[PDB]
Amino acid sequence: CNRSCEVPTRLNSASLKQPYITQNYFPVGTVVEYECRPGYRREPSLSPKLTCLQNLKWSTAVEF
């Protein structure tokens, strides 16, 4: 029962991969990774990763 984050930010063009999409209990420092929603393509100038910070909120994630 450590401190945990919320569900990661639902983007309208990106969904989570499949070790992360089911499991709860995101501790601090945990990185999660997104994949393109099926019909889309990657923007190579942006890295699709999100770190949960000390204040139990994810980093800013906009459009991957």
Partner: protein
């Protein structure tokens, strides 16, 4: 080449057939991907209307023995993108001779029907195209490197103006920075 310094280096070499193309992009400072994050583009993305002429400077960063000519051309919209050299020489072009003065200025004038154009993408205020064409070739002597690099600049003239304050589409924040 975005993740290096090679985004700024335009390739140029000696060509086995003249009349080819060198590069090209769309004249939209703030919407087009080429001059999006430039100084003029980053001042210009906090606005929503712009007007005035735009300068373009081409520094040839090659050998001192190399020589050749280029065709720096602007074509107003209404037709398509030009596909030959003889279709792009109908626009507003300049022939640039590489010599001791190593840089030229392509000044793109203000050809519009409205007093302002939008900094974003809409079809009513399309703005034209900038293309560059090999005029003859690059000619080098022996034991001099053929493949050189042209650098492109951009600036505004003394009649450039912006109108509508909006927020930039590039600032993004998810939580407070602590």
């Amino acid at each position: 080449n975005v993740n290096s310094l090679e985004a700024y280096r335009i390739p140029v070499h000696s060509v086995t057939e003249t009349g080819a193309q060198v590069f090209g992009f769309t004249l939209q400072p703030g919407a087009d991907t080429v001059m999006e994050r430039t100084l003029l583009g980053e001042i210009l993305n906090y606005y929503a209307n712009w007007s005035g002429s735009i300068k373009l400077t081409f520094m040839y960063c090659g050998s001192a023995m190399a020589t050749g000519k280029f065709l720096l051309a602007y074509s107003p919209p209404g037709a398509g993108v030009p596909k030959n050299r003889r279709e792009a020489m109908l626009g507003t072009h300049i022939i640039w001779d590489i010599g001791l003065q190593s840089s030229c200025v392509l000044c793109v004038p203000w050809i519009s029907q409205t007093h302002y154009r939008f900094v974003s993408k809409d079809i009513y205020t399309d703005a034209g195209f900038i293309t560059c064409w090999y005029q003859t070739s690059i000619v080098v002597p022996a034991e001099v490197q053929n493949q050189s690099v042209i650098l492109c600049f951009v600036s505004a003239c003394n009649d450039f103006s912006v109108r509508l304050l909006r927020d930039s589409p590039f600032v993004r924040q998810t939580a407070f920075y602590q």
